[PDB]
Amino acid sequence: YTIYNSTGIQIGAYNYMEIG
Amino acid sequence: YTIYNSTGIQIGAYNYMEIG
Amino acid sequence: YTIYNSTGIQIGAYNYMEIG
């Protein structure tokens, strides 16, 4: 998928996500 | 996908996303 | 999946996620 990002991601799902 | 971003993303899904 | 990111992710699930 070639990300090498620097903060938090999903990759496709059926659930929430939070970053505070 | 060639991202190397610096904060949080989805990649295409059927679920929510939040960043606080 | 070829990530080698630099902060925290899910990979697809049925549960929450938080990063403070």
Interatomic CA distance for residues A19 and A11, integer angstroms: 15
* Residue whose structure tokens are 């679920």: B15
Using the beta-carbon criterion (under 8 Å), do A15 and C15 form an inter-chain contact?
yes
Interatomic CA distance for residues B7 and B15, integer angstroms: 18
Which of A5, A13, A18 minimises the CB distance to B13? A13
Q: Are C1 and C11 in contact (CB under 8 A)?
A: yes
DSSP calls for chain C: -----SS----S-SS-----
Measure in Å the smallest separation between the Cα of B9 and chain A Cα atoms: 5
**What resolution in angstroms, rounded to 1 decimal?**
4.7
DSSP calls for chain A: -----SS----S-SS-----
What would the two tokens of residue B1 be? Answer: 């996908």
What would the two tokens of residue A6 be? Answer: 């620097």
Q: Are B10 and B16 in contact (CB under 8 A)?
A: no
Q: Are A12 and B10 in contact (CB under 8 A)?
A: yes
Measure in Å the smallest separation between the Cα of A10 and chain B Cα atoms: 5
Distances (CA, A) of C3 to A3, C12, C15, C19: 5, 14, 21, 18
